[PDB]
């Protein structure tokens, strides 16, 4: 089960590009939105773009980018929210969430919070 993560905030799927960029797209057949989520501990996951073979990372200035190397910035606590939506909080920057703006650009982790629509993803089959 590779999957797609559809963000509630604006209707964009999370995309990991081969050059390291991360953003959102509305087109469901884009190959770069197919992701592999692998658990480490119970409740902790890494998120990998299948095509790109790169991991989602959150950096110290809040931005999202995709690393070919796993680092301690590539792990997220996965939490079940209401109605099957899931959130992803950094294991290193523990108050920052993975999120997309209504425009489909990422939102800095540094400006997120637990009740924002920006942090809610619906997992989908790819």
Cα–Cα dist 118/79, whole Å: 15
The residue among 6, 36, 4 whose CA lies nearest residue 120 is 6
* Method for this entry: X-ray
Q: What is the resolution of this structure in A?
A: 1.8
The residue among 115, 55, 120, 124 whose CA lies nearest residue 91 is 55
Q: Where are the beta strands (DSSP E) in the chain?
A: 3-7, 12-16, 22-25, 35-39, 44-49, 54-58, 64-67, 76-80, 86-90, 121-125
Is 57 in contact with 49 (CB distance < 8 Å)? Answer: no
Options 2.30.40.10, 1.10.10.350, 3.40.309.10, 2.80.10.50; CATH for 1-126 is 2.80.10.50
What are the backbone angles phi and psi of residue 67, rounded to the nearest 5°?
A: -95, 135
What is the length of the chain? Answer: 126
Buried b (16+ CB within 10 A) or exposed e, 100-120: bbeebebbbbeebeeeeebbb
85, 91, 97, 98: CA torsion to nearest 10 = -80
Calculate Rg over the CA atoms of the chain.
Answer: 13
- Sorted by where each begins, the domain ranges of the chain are 1-126
Is 87 in contact with 120 (CB distance < 8 Å)? Answer: yes
Tracing tokens 């990372």 back to the chain, one arrives at 57
Annotated ligand binding at 9? The verdict is yes
């Amino acid at each position: 089960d590779p999957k797609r993560l559809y963000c509630k905030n604006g209707g964009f799927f999370l995309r990991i590009h081969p050059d390291g960029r991360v953003d959102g797209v509305r087109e469901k057949s884009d190959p770069h939105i197919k992701l592999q989520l692998q658990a480490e501990e119970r409740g902790v996951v890494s998120i990998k773009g299948v095509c790109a073979n790169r991991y989602l990372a959150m950096k110290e200035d809040g931005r999202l980018l995709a690393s070919k190397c796993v680092t301690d910035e590539c792990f997220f606590f996965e939490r079940l929210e209401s109605n099957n939506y899931n959130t992803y909080r950094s294991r290193k920057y523990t108050s920052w969430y993975v999120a997309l703006k209504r425009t489909g650009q990422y939102k800095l982790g540094s400006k997120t919070g637990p009740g924002q629509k920006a942090i809610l993803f619906l997992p989908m089959s790819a």
